Structure formats: structure tokens, C-alpha cells
């Protein structure tokens, strides 16, 4: 009998309302408008992926997080990590991504006493006033493109909760689109042999669309994966948070 | 054609999600500091629930409490992660000695992060140095018994998320204290499928209040199992008990 399957589905659908409530959608739309786009597709109804955003007068903090697991266990991690990120932003400010990650790690260790509790994160402080960007990541990269060149600011090879973090500071040039993605989109199986999309198809896709309006890029990226994937099930939670300077 | 493998996947996922929820519980700290001066009864309705409990040891005393978040199952379990972190923030912002201030601050921390979102909580600051207690609750009571009388320090009839004060009380020797969510008192059973209730609960506490707390815990489980019979578990159950002298 599939009556139990209906019960769980209704329970998870309501749990997705809780997980959506912790996402900064409204704030992103109201402050960045079309100078951002969000792609957020959990594998199940609730996932282990989420994203953060904190607007300041002089710039903004923006990031993506992939907590251990997907489904319900991943979604539980997402609640803890969202609160751990808020604590960290309050303890060290929103301008130092490496300090935020260090403090997030500590806050997580403080709440969780064999359990996979590690998490990937890519955090960026966009300092509009001083025209420079600070990035710090644990197994998450910052991709940047002007439609000609594709740069990848690689994150540390260590996940949060196992590592000391450092910021990568780049000049902030106009005409550049930035992309923060979890592994899910790049790991999506598909195509002729069932290989994951990968870093090379991803960098090419970004360069190809980087100069385009971000609402158009978002649509093209969704249609590019839908096409690639075909009949293959979604392998992992997908998140792409994009933002553009001038 | 019956894709039953999905039901296995979800079951294994929930069982692993219960390891995450158990990791946020202060079991180890409670056992290491209170030993047999405490007992915990924690039984979610499903694999994961909306109920949890807190504990924070200080040099001069301890903070102990129970929380019942909106819902049960997975949605309830998501609320517990948020509330656990909101309680940590509140303890850091106002200290672990003012239960009413902790509840106020927990409410604010919850409103900043987030739909039924209200929650019940009963928080107690046990002062060892002043030989007193401070209690504040939102739809949760503090029960006390010496095996003869039963005292109930009632919490506000409003939940955290609607509209808090401390009730200070002296610690007399031979008294056992009990913090329970509504789940045990709402358990359907008996002759007419009625919930256990406050009067059967007070009598149960009085009947066992003189026993070692590991024995009380067992008697409480056997009392509900008997009452419940064939009735399914109606809600998440939590009983956190503590004793001084
Ligand atoms: Mg994950
Ligand atoms: Mg990975
Ligand atoms: Mg992933
Ligand atoms: Mg509940
Ligand atoms: Mg109730
Ligand atoms: Mg309840």
C-alpha cells in the first residue's frame, strides 16, 4: 500500500516550507534584482544544500553551502548550519569569509556532539565601495567570467568539520559575472555515456552565457542540464548562486 | 512493478536523521554531571520528532529544560535544529540563570531565522549555591513531588510565538522535579481512549517520587504502556526529571 508514501510526501512538502523560510530569496530580489540569479533544486523535497546572503551599505556577503547528505539528514544539517552562519556573521562581521567559515566550523562542533557532519561552503564578501572581492571556500570554488575569460578561485581541499581558512582577494572589475555552485550540477550524470556534467562543460557554459542578463543565464543553465540529463535521475541537490558587478 | 525500495530508502534516511537529532541532545553531559539525580524519557512519535531537551552545567548550578516545537516527524525535527541553536544564542546573550529572559531571547532568535512555528518550553535554573530554583514556561509546567504532595508551577497558557516571568522556589530535600511535554499527558488510552491527563500524571509522580530516578523512569514507561494498550503513540514524548538532596 502507497498510503504511507502519501503521508511521508505531505510531511516532506510541509518540511520544504520550513527549509524555504531559511533562504534569503526576498532580500536577494529586493537588493540585487537582476544582478543575481538562484538555481536551487533539492534531489528530494528537502536537501542538504542552501545559500546565504547579507546586504551591507558598502557591499554584501553571499554564499552556498552543501551539508553532509541530502534528503531529511541533509535538511537537518542545513538548519544547524544556517544558525551557525548567523552566529559567525554576528561574532566576526560579514566582511571576512575565512573568519566566518572558522567560526561556523566552531559553532557546528559546539552543537553536534559514526556521523558524517562535514560541509562544503563558498563564501564571498563583495566590497562594492573598495571595488574588491574576498572569497574563502571549503571544497567550493568561485567561478568568474566576463564572457571571454573564465577564472576559478579554488576553495580548500578540506570540508568544514574534520582546517585553517584564508581569503583570496581579487580586484572587482565591471562586466564580470560570478558563480557559486555546489558539486550537484557538476556531478549530474547524463549525455551519451552517463558521465557527470563536469568542470570543463561547466566553465564553457559560464563563458558562453556570462555577458547575458542573469534571468536569461538561469533559464539557459536549467535547460542545458535538463537536456544533458535526459532520462537520468537527479544525482544530488543542485544550487547555483550567481551575482554580477556593474 | 511495486517500487517498494523507495520505502526502504526513506526509512534508512530517517534512521540516519535520528542520529543527527540525538547528537544535539545533552545526554552525555547530563550523565556525567547529574548521574542518577536525573532521568530522561525521550520517545519521538516517528523516528524523529519535534521534542528536545536542554541542559547547561555551571559552577554554581545548572540550566535544564524541555521544548516541544510545532509539529512532529520531519517538520518538527527541523524546528528542533533551529530551536537548539536559538537556545544557545539566548544562553550566550542573557546567561543560563534567567529562564524567562532565555525564553524571550529564544522567541526573537526564532523570528529572525524564520507556517506553524510556535513552541512550548519549560526552563529551570537550579541554583546550588542559593539552594533555590527559577522556573519559566510557555505551555509547560514544572511538577515537584516528595511522595506525599504534588506541586505544579504552571507555565503561561501561551506558546513561544504568540504575545515571560520567573517563578522562584526553595529547594527542600526529598523532592523530585519533572519537566514533561504534553505528549505523555496527551497519550490516548484506557477505558474511553481519553488522554492520560494531568490528574493521572500527578498521581503517578506522587506514587513514584521516592524511588531512585532510574526506577521512576521504568515505572513511568510501564504506566503509559499499560494505559495505552493497543492505541498508537499520539505525540512525541519527553520527560526530564532531576532531584536535589
Ligand atoms: Mg549534501
Ligand atoms: Mg563534492
Ligand atoms: Mg552535493
Ligand atoms: Mg511538536
Ligand atoms: Mg499541546
Ligand atoms: Mg507535544
Author numbering:
A (entry chain B): 409 to 521, 528 to 576, 580 to 663
B (entry chain A): 407 to 520, 529 to 577, 582 to 663
Text lifted from the article:
Native crystals of SiaA-PP2C were obtained in conditions A11 (0.03 M MgCl2, 0.03 M CaCl2, 0.1 M tris, 0.1 M BICINE, 20% v/v glycerol, 10% w/v PEG 40000, pH 8.5) from Morpheus (Molecular Dimensions) with space group of P212121 and diffracted to a resolution of 2.1 Å. The SiaA-PP2C domain is arranged as a tight dimer in the crystal asymmetric unit. The SiaA-PP2C monomer adopts the canonical α-β-β-α fold first described for the human PPM1A and subsequently found in several other phosphatases. The core structure of the SiaA-PP2C monomer is a β-sandwich composed of two antiparallel β-sheets each comprising five β-strands. The two monomers interact extensively with each other through residues projecting from helices α1, α2 and α3, forming a compact homodimer that buries a total solvent accessible area of 1392 Å2. Consistently, in size-exclusion chromatography, instead of monomer (~33 kDa), SiaA-PP2C eluted as a 66 kDa dimer, suggesting SiaA exists mainly as dimer in solution. The two Mg2+ ions labelled as M1 and M2 directly involved in the catalytic mechanism are coordinated by oxygen atoms from three evolutionary conserved aspartate residues and occupy equivalent positions in SiaA-PP2C compared to the two Mn2+ ions found in the Rv1364C active site. Compared to Rv1364C, which only has two bound metal ions, a third Mg2+ ion (M3) was found in SiaA-PP2C coordinated by D600 and with an incomplete octahedral coordination shell. We note that near the entrance of the active site, a hydrophobic pocket lined with residues I554, V564, L603, F619 and A620 constitutes a potential site for the design of inhibitors. Another distinct feature of SiaA-PP2C is a flexible loop located between β7 and β8, whereas a Flap subdomain, which has been reported to aid in substrate specificity, is present at the equivalent position in human PPM1A and many other PP2C-type phosphatases.
